[PDB]
Design an enzyme around this catalytic site. Structure first.
Site, PDB file in Angstrom:
ATOM      1  N   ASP A 161     -65.929  -3.563 -53.531  1.00 15.80           N
ATOM      2  CA  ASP A 161     -66.857  -3.648 -52.417  1.00 15.80           C
ATOM      3  C   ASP A 161     -66.703  -5.016 -51.726  1.00 15.80           C
ATOM      4  O   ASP A 161     -67.651  -5.768 -51.578  1.00 15.80           O
ATOM      5  CB  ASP A 161     -68.295  -3.427 -52.915  1.00 15.80           C
ATOM      6  CG  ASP A 161     -68.448  -2.169 -53.796  1.00 15.80           C
ATOM      7  OD1 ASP A 161     -67.924  -2.135 -54.921  1.00 15.80           O
ATOM      8  OD2 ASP A 161     -69.136  -1.216 -53.397  1.00 15.80           O
ATOM      9  N   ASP A 163     -64.695   0.729 -51.534  1.00 15.34           N
ATOM     10  CA  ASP A 163     -65.368   0.066 -50.418  1.00 15.34           C
ATOM     11  C   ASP A 163     -64.585  -1.135 -49.904  1.00 15.34           C
ATOM     12  O   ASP A 163     -64.801  -2.278 -50.322  1.00 15.34           O
ATOM     13  CB  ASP A 163     -66.824  -0.311 -50.729  1.00 15.34           C
ATOM     14  CG  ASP A 163     -67.730   0.896 -50.799  1.00 15.34           C
ATOM     15  OD1 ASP A 163     -67.287   2.008 -50.431  1.00 15.34           O
ATOM     16  OD2 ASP A 163     -68.885   0.740 -51.227  1.00 15.34           O
ATOM     17  N   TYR A 171     -65.822  -1.675 -44.726  1.00 13.31           N
ATOM     18  CA  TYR A 171     -67.176  -1.446 -44.231  1.00 13.31           C
ATOM     19  C   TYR A 171     -67.190  -1.372 -42.708  1.00 13.31           C
ATOM     20  O   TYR A 171     -68.207  -1.649 -42.066  1.00 13.31           O
ATOM     21  CB  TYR A 171     -68.114  -2.559 -44.691  1.00 13.31           C
ATOM     22  CG  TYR A 171     -68.432  -2.523 -46.155  1.00 13.31           C
ATOM     23  CD1 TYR A 171     -67.511  -2.967 -47.102  1.00 13.31           C
ATOM     24  CD2 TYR A 171     -69.661  -2.044 -46.606  1.00 13.31           C
ATOM     25  CE1 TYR A 171     -67.811  -2.933 -48.462  1.00 13.31           C
ATOM     26  CE2 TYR A 171     -69.965  -2.008 -47.960  1.00 13.31           C
ATOM     27  CZ  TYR A 171     -69.042  -2.450 -48.877  1.00 13.31           C
ATOM     28  OH  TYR A 171     -69.353  -2.411 -50.214  1.00 13.31           O
ATOM     29  N   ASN A 185     -67.373   5.133 -51.109  1.00 17.54           N
ATOM     30  CA  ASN A 185     -68.101   5.909 -50.104  1.00 17.54           C
ATOM     31  C   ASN A 185     -67.964   5.399 -48.665  1.00 17.54           C
ATOM     32  O   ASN A 185     -68.135   6.163 -47.726  1.00 17.54           O
ATOM     33  CB  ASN A 185     -69.576   6.133 -50.482  1.00 17.54           C
ATOM     34  CG  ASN A 185     -70.359   4.845 -50.575  1.00 17.54           C
ATOM     35  OD1 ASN A 185     -69.961   3.924 -51.268  1.00 17.54           O
ATOM     36  ND2 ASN A 185     -71.479   4.776 -49.873  1.00 17.54           N
ATOM     37  N   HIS A 186     -67.632   4.126 -48.488  1.00 20.98           N
ATOM     38  CA  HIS A 186     -67.414   3.615 -47.138  1.00 20.98           C
ATOM     39  C   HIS A 186     -66.085   4.063 -46.538  1.00 20.98           C
ATOM     40  O   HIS A 186     -65.869   3.925 -45.335  1.00 20.98           O
ATOM     41  CB  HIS A 186     -67.595   2.098 -47.061  1.00 20.98           C
ATOM     42  CG  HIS A 186     -69.029   1.677 -47.128  1.00 20.98           C
ATOM     43  ND1 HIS A 186     -69.853   1.683 -46.026  1.00 20.98           N
ATOM     44  CD2 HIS A 186     -69.798   1.285 -48.174  1.00 20.98           C
ATOM     45  CE1 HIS A 186     -71.064   1.291 -46.382  1.00 20.98           C
ATOM     46  NE2 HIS A 186     -71.059   1.052 -47.681  1.00 20.98           N
ATOM     47  N   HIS A 238     -65.264   4.704 -58.115  1.00 21.91           N
ATOM     48  CA  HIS A 238     -66.169   3.920 -57.281  1.00 21.91           C
ATOM     49  C   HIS A 238     -67.594   3.830 -57.824  1.00 21.91           C
ATOM     50  O   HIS A 238     -68.141   2.737 -57.952  1.00 21.91           O
ATOM     51  CB  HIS A 238     -66.213   4.396 -55.829  1.00 21.91           C
ATOM     52  CG  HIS A 238     -67.021   3.492 -54.955  1.00 21.91           C
ATOM     53  ND1 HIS A 238     -66.684   2.170 -54.747  1.00 21.91           N
ATOM     54  CD2 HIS A 238     -68.187   3.690 -54.296  1.00 21.91           C
ATOM     55  CE1 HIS A 238     -67.587   1.605 -53.970  1.00 21.91           C
ATOM     56  NE2 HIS A 238     -68.510   2.507 -53.682  1.00 21.91           N
ATOM     57  N   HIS A 266     -80.524   0.088 -57.052  1.00 21.43           N
ATOM     58  CA  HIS A 266     -79.639   0.614 -56.024  1.00 21.43           C
ATOM     59  C   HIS A 266     -78.679   1.627 -56.643  1.00 21.43           C
ATOM     60  O   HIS A 266     -77.935   1.302 -57.579  1.00 21.43           O
ATOM     61  CB  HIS A 266     -78.861  -0.519 -55.355  1.00 21.43           C
ATOM     62  CG  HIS A 266     -78.303  -0.164 -54.008  1.00 21.43           C
ATOM     63  ND1 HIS A 266     -78.887   0.771 -53.180  1.00 21.43           N
ATOM     64  CD2 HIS A 266     -77.219  -0.630 -53.342  1.00 21.43           C
ATOM     65  CE1 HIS A 266     -78.183   0.873 -52.068  1.00 21.43           C
ATOM     66  NE2 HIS A 266     -77.170   0.029 -52.137  1.00 21.43           N
ATOM     67  N   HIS A 267     -78.712   2.852 -56.121  1.00 29.11           N
ATOM     68  CA  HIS A 267     -77.804   3.917 -56.547  1.00 29.11           C
ATOM     69  C   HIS A 267     -78.017   4.327 -57.996  1.00 29.11           C
ATOM     70  O   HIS A 267     -77.108   4.874 -58.626  1.00 29.11           O
ATOM     71  CB  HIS A 267     -76.347   3.497 -56.361  1.00 29.11           C
ATOM     72  CG  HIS A 267     -75.984   3.139 -54.952  1.00 29.11           C
ATOM     73  ND1 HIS A 267     -76.318   3.928 -53.870  1.00 29.11           N
ATOM     74  CD2 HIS A 267     -75.289   2.089 -54.452  1.00 29.11           C
ATOM     75  CE1 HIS A 267     -75.850   3.377 -52.764  1.00 29.11           C
ATOM     76  NE2 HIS A 267     -75.223   2.259 -53.089  1.00 29.11           N
ATOM     77  N   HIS A 281     -69.561  -0.104 -56.089  1.00 25.07           N
ATOM     78  CA  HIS A 281     -70.654   0.636 -55.441  1.00 25.07           C
ATOM     79  C   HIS A 281     -71.984  -0.115 -55.536  1.00 25.07           C
ATOM     80  O   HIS A 281     -72.658  -0.334 -54.523  1.00 25.07           O
ATOM     81  CB  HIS A 281     -70.780   2.034 -56.054  1.00 25.07           C
ATOM     82  CG  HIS A 281     -71.668   2.982 -55.294  1.00 25.07           C
ATOM     83  ND1 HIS A 281     -71.620   3.128 -53.923  1.00 25.07           N
ATOM     84  CD2 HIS A 281     -72.583   3.882 -55.733  1.00 25.07           C
ATOM     85  CE1 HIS A 281     -72.486   4.055 -53.547  1.00 25.07           C
ATOM     86  NE2 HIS A 281     -73.083   4.528 -54.628  1.00 25.07           N
ATOM     87  N   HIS A 322     -73.926  -3.439 -55.824  1.00 24.71           N
ATOM     88  CA  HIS A 322     -73.564  -4.775 -55.405  1.00 24.71           C
ATOM     89  C   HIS A 322     -74.032  -5.851 -56.379  1.00 24.71           C
ATOM     90  O   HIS A 322     -74.879  -6.681 -56.055  1.00 24.71           O
ATOM     91  CB  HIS A 322     -74.032  -5.018 -53.972  1.00 24.71           C
ATOM     92  CG  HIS A 322     -73.413  -4.074 -52.994  1.00 24.71           C
ATOM     93  ND1 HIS A 322     -74.014  -3.725 -51.802  1.00 24.71           N
ATOM     94  CD2 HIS A 322     -72.254  -3.372 -53.051  1.00 24.71           C
ATOM     95  CE1 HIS A 322     -73.241  -2.867 -51.157  1.00 24.71           C
ATOM     96  NE2 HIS A 322     -72.165  -2.641 -51.891  1.00 24.71           N
TER      97      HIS A 322
HETATM   98  C1  LIG Z   1     -80.895   4.687 -49.543  1.00 27.38           C
HETATM   99  C2  LIG Z   1     -79.623   3.909 -49.451  1.00 27.38           C
HETATM  100  C3  LIG Z   1     -79.613   2.646 -48.866  1.00 27.38           C
HETATM  101  C4  LIG Z   1     -78.424   1.927 -48.786  1.00 27.38           C
HETATM  102  C5  LIG Z   1     -77.239   2.466 -49.287  1.00 27.38           C
HETATM  103  C6  LIG Z   1     -75.963   1.686 -49.205  1.00 27.38           C
HETATM  104  N1  LIG Z   1     -74.933   1.731 -50.087  1.00 27.38           N
HETATM  105  C7  LIG Z   1     -73.881   0.899 -49.781  1.00 27.38           C
HETATM  106  C8  LIG Z   1     -72.651   0.812 -50.609  1.00 27.38           C
HETATM  107  O1  LIG Z   1     -72.027  -0.258 -50.669  1.00 27.38           O
HETATM  108  O2  LIG Z   1     -72.208   1.805 -51.222  1.00 27.38           O
HETATM  109  C9  LIG Z   1     -74.029   0.129 -48.615  1.00 27.38           C
HETATM  110  S1  LIG Z   1     -75.556   0.557 -48.009  1.00 27.38           S
HETATM  111  C10 LIG Z   1     -77.254   3.730 -49.870  1.00 27.38           C
HETATM  112  C11 LIG Z   1     -78.444   4.444 -49.955  1.00 27.38           C
HETATM  113 FE   LIG Z   2     -70.241  -1.026 -51.545  1.00 24.88          FE
HETATM  114 ZN   LIG Z   3     -70.114   2.144 -52.511  1.00 26.39          ZN
END
Ligand SMILES: Cc1ccc(-c2nc(C(=O)O)cs2)cc1
Ligand SMILES: [Fe+3]
Ligand SMILES: [Zn+2]
Ligand SMILES: *[C@@H]1O[C@H](CO)[C@@H](O[C@@H]2O[C@H](CO)[C@@H](O)[C@H](O)[C@H]2NC(C)=O)[C@H](O[C@@H]2O[C@@H](C)[C@@H](O)[C@@H](O)[C@@H]2O)[C@H]1NC(C)=O
Ligand SMILES: *[C@@H]1O[C@H](CO)[C@@H](O[C@@H]2O[C@H](CO)[C@@H](O)[C@H](O)[C@H]2NC(C)=O)[C@H](O[C@@H]2O[C@@H](C)[C@@H](O)[C@@H](O)[C@@H]2O)[C@H]1NC(C)=O
Ligand SMILES: *[C@@H]1O[C@H](CO)[C@@H](O[C@@H]2O[C@H](CO)[C@@H](O)[C@H](O)[C@H]2NC(C)=O)[C@H](O[C@@H]2O[C@@H](C)[C@@H](O)[C@@H](O)[C@@H]2O)[C@H]1NC(C)=O
Ligand SMILES: *[C@@H]1O[C@H](CO)[C@@H](O[C@@H]2O[C@H](CO)[C@@H](O)[C@H](O)[C@H]2NC(C)=O)[C@H](O[C@@H]2O[C@@H](C)[C@@H](O)[C@@H](O)[C@@H]2O)[C@H]1NC(C)=O
Ligand SMILES: *[C@@H]1O[C@H](CO)[C@@H](O)[C@H](O[C@@H]2O[C@@H](C)[C@@H](O)[C@@H](O)[C@@H]2O)[C@H]1NC(C)=O
Ligand SMILES: Cc1ccc(-c2nc(C(=O)O)cs2)cc1
Ligand SMILES: *[C@@H]1O[C@H](CO)[C@@H](O)[C@H](O)[C@H]1NC(C)=O
Ligand SMILES: *[C@@H]1O[C@H](CO)[C@@H](O)[C@H](O)[C@H]1NC(C)=O
Ligand SMILES: *[C@@H]1O[C@H](CO)[C@@H](O)[C@H](O)[C@H]1NC(C)=O
Ligand SMILES: [Fe+3]
Ligand SMILES: [Zn+2]
Lengths: 423, 424
Positions: B128, B157, B160, B194-195, B279, B288-289, B316, B318
């Site tokens: 990332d 990633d 971006y 995913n990006h 990833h 997060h995630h 994925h 951070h």
């Molecule tokens: C609800 C939500 C908010 C940010 C995100 C993000 N993920 C990323 C990533 O680096 O995968 C950047 S923004 C995914 C789901």
């Molecule tokens: Fe990422």
């Molecule tokens: Zn990601």
């Protein structure tokens, strides 16, 4: 072995130079005013034109379609035709003809009534059909049903051609001539199963779903899907969502993304009955394929409960099972909540992949019967989902060893939106 | 907004008419005897020929590649070149030159040694990355590391660019120009995150991975894969398996089928270190995630344990996390066994998606730390997985706020096949 011989009556070739064969139809648009007409000609390309008319208006019109072909290893397909008839009237009988250039064959279908809150409709459920003798019995049972199925919801695993040497695609052709006697006259709603994948690098065939995708078209663009493998339609009082067990469904993927928006589009005051089709069961207490559905279940189960899906149909397992209304969406890795619980907002999960396949039933079950399982039995058969109104739908299961009017299992569905009482 | 402005020095355009830019290399075969050489020309298509030679023999050779272009919405790419150099000698410095028709630029790389049981090798770990100021610092820390990374294992990633209006693909060009100072001289092994998906039906771009897949090629045929998004390579004493979090992995799918067969092909007597890249993390105790990795885990976890995967790297999220050796493979729906347990046959799971992204760290953590989690910290950084021999590998994590030689976390891996001792 248990598959019907090539010279079986069900596989006979319709006579005449370039006579259309393997004729089949399915819903062509979002709401039921269109129909995709499909067929194969073997002697030469022929016309993709389709002549059609209602038995009231009597006015004959022409729709123009497309022709295509494909190869699989050392197999070369005939000429495949797909043509869409649009702007039909609701609830009316149409006749249609194909083979206009040489040998015409005529058929008919009955458009469904306009979508609506209290519109009755009878769907057949067939899964994992194949082309064994058991397969032929199931189809006979469905067509001879007193309930009178108006549309088949097909949960995947069509021909089983891939069991043959180099997937001998002739066995797609035979399955097509075989099923015609039903799908020529009423739509079948296609779901892609693992037998449709046909991923075979060892003979340099690496495009997933090729034979299937050429032969069976679906109106996927109509629901703003970017793929034939997931899409939705509406018919009568049902909103039907077809998912692909064997496509990507991770967060951010096209199918995941499409499903999430699609659920927001559902209107239960128009289509009270929310129905999902997929090949691989999310709930399954047979040994065979046990827990295969776990991955999709982690992504989609919570969505199904949040939107109060009435029922989820799957095949894949060669047997019958009906779950309780339960959910298993509370798990957080370390909170220990991994047991399914009674949940009146959840759908019932029905496994109906017992139509005959290549002649083998899955009879080994996990013991004892889990609390999430209401009823299960290893017999060949098929289902009927009979919508009476916005509150009541009657599901029945008919076995091949029984009389055509016998229901070995039945249950009243109480609508999750309009009437969410214990059923 | 912490993205580096278009006029930054890292994004400067190499001078000269049609000078190659965004130059990057990656392994081009199964065992390290080939290298895929990639670059973009902006003024005209140019030649896809690569001139190269070893230091040892100093005989100049030419390999011919292919040019390609793409469009994404109202963006038209420049001219992308991919050329594979083959039959390289092991453990040897090569020079290569691109842009033979107008402006020539010269670079170099060193082939890895032949695969073997005790062949030492140092892998960088980066996830990332993005193109923010933090991203620049992480890349500086990597290149300045006294451990001297020889190949980057990149867990997804990349640019971006998809955070920009219409995914402004100019932001892929800047990323390519900025990462050049490393990837032109050592291979980065690409994982799709995913990006890279870039699924944007709203502007009629419905083909997943398009920009990514045009710009970054992998040697996927060499491991009999039918897709760029999952594949294998062998390098020194490592067998590296790259997976696609955002492709299908259902039973019977190409990916599922390929991974299953590929695990059976692994020869731990030839490459002791078995490493998986993906990833999305299968173990992750950050908010997060949280739990996104669950689906792949249910499909593949038991296989990893069965084949004694040494380590699984992902991004994925951070931040940084290192799990214990654990498994959660005993669950049967009704038997209540859904808690991860200590499992010395299991791989260590490492989250290393903290190279910078667009300047945001994931600091929110589930509390208290789970028993499955050994160490975690929300800081920017990169990893190093330093293989010593068939039994010992040293992993270390470096922070952007520390000195380039400082290890904030570090642990000895004992090989699961050759030295299965409790390395906790
Ligand atoms: C609800 C939500 C908010 C940010 C995100 C993000 N993920 C990323 C990533 O680096 O995968 C950047 S923004 C995914 C789901
Ligand atoms: Fe990422
Ligand atoms: Zn990601
Ligand atoms: C929706 O269809 C249901 C199934 O046919 C209707 O229930 C059936 O109603 C008959 C007389 O209305 C009665 O003889 C049947 O026993 C009954 N079947 C079942 C399984 O209950 C239903 O009619 C309503 O609901 C039931 C519970 C009673 O309250 C009836 O008086 C209602 O009319 C239909 N409901 C609607 C909204 O039309
Ligand atoms: C691609 O489409 C974009 C709009 O959808 C272009 O940017 C926009 O251009 C408008 C004037 O044409 C400007 O007022 C808007 O602020 C801007 N919109 C956004 C969200 O960036 C873009 O054009 C280029 O870049 C912009 C910033 C300006 O410098 C324009 O002069 C440029 O054409 C389009 N790019 C291409 C390659 O067409
Ligand atoms: C890019 O490199 C090309 C050679 O690899 C240049 O073409 C060559 O230019 C020579 C002038 O030094 C001339 O003698 C050659 O005949 C020519 N070779 C060809 C055309 O194949 C090219 O040069 C520009 O384009 C040519 C056609 C002439 O217009 C030159 O005066 C131009 O400078 C190089 N392009 C540029 C812009 O440098
Ligand atoms: C494989 O690499 C290991 C790490 O470099 C070797 O261990 C190191 O051996 C050094 C002396 O050779 C010793 O001073 C270091 O402390 C030690 N490092 C660690 C982290 O243990 C290992 O060497 C073998 O095993 C060690 C424990 C000792 O028994 C040495 O005598 C052995 O050489 C390397 N394996 C082999 C076979 O070389
Ligand atoms: C199929 O229909 C077309 C169009 O009506 C006919 O032309 C074909 O006739 C056959 O081919 C033509 C060229 C002519 O030679 C006629 O004698 C043939 O019978 C018809 N195909 C067949 C074989 O009936
Ligand atoms: C095994 N699996 C099947 C299937 O239904 O996918 C048939 S044999
Ligand atoms: C299949 O069933 C149909 C209808 O019941 C019957 O007419 C036909 O003979 C059967 N064919 C075979 C091969 O079983
Ligand atoms: C295809 O190959 C098989 C043998 O592998 C052969 O028996 C069969 O007849 C072939 N079919 C065609 C159409 O050539
Ligand atoms: C990025 O890092 C390099 C090396 O540390 C430095 O020389 C350069 O100025 C930095 N650029 C930016 C924009 O941060
Ligand atoms: Fe089946
Ligand atoms: Zn199946």
């Amino acid at each position: 072995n248990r598959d019907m011989p090539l010279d079986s009556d069900v596989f006979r070739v319709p006579p005449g130079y370039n006579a259309p064969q393997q004729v089949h139809i399915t819903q062509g648009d979002l709401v039921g005013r269109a129909m995709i007409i499909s067929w194969v000609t073997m002697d030469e390309p022929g016309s993709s034109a389709v002549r059609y008319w209602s038995e009231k208006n009597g006015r004959k019109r022409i729709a123009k379609g497309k022709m295509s072909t494909y190869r699989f290893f050392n197999y070369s397909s005939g000429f495949i035709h797909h043509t869409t008839i649009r702007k039909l009237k609701y609830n009316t009988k149409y006749y249609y003809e194909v083979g206009l250039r040489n040998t015409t064959r005529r058929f008919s279908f009955i458009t469904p009534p306009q979508t609506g809150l209290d519109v009755p409709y009878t769907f057949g459920l067939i899964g994992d059909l194949g082309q064994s003798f058991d397969s032929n019995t199931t189809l006979s049972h469905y067509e001879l049903s007193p309930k009178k199925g108006q549309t088949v919801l097909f949960v995947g695993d069509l021909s089983y051609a891939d069991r043959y040497p180099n997937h001998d695609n002739v066995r797609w052709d035979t399955w097509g001539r075989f099923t015609e006697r039903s799908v020529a006259y009423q739509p079948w709603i296609w779901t892609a199963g693992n037998h449709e994948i046909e991923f075979a690098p060892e003979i340099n065939e690496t495009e997933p779903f090729k034979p299937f995708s050429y032969r069976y078209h679906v109106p996927y663009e109509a629901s703003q899907s970017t793929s034939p493998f997931w899409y939705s339609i509406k018919r009568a009082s049902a909103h039907i969502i077809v998912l692909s067990s064997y496509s990507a469904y991770g967060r951010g993927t096209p199918q995941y993304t499409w499903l999430k928006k699609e659920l927001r589009k559902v209107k239960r005051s128009e289509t009270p009955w929310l129905i999902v089709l997929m090949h691989s069961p999310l709930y399954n207490s047979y040994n065979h394929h046990f827990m295969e559905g776990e991955a999709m279940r982690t992504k989609f189960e919570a969505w199904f409960v949040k939107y109060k899906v009435d029922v989820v149909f799957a095949g894949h397992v060669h047997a019958y099972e009906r779950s309780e209304r339960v959910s298993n969406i509370a798990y957080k890795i370390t909170n220990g909540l991994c047991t399914p619980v009674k949940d009146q907002s959840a759908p019932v999960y029905i496994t109906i992949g017992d139509a005959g396949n290549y002649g083998v039933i899955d009879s080994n079950m996990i013991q004892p019967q889990p609390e999430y399982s209401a009823f299960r039995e290893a017999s060949f058969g098929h289902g009927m989902f009979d919508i009476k109104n916005r509150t009541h739908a009657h599901f029945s299961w008919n076995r091949n060893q029984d009389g055509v009017a016998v229901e070995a299992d039945s249950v009243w569905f109480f609508n999750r939106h309009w009437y969410p009482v214990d059923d």
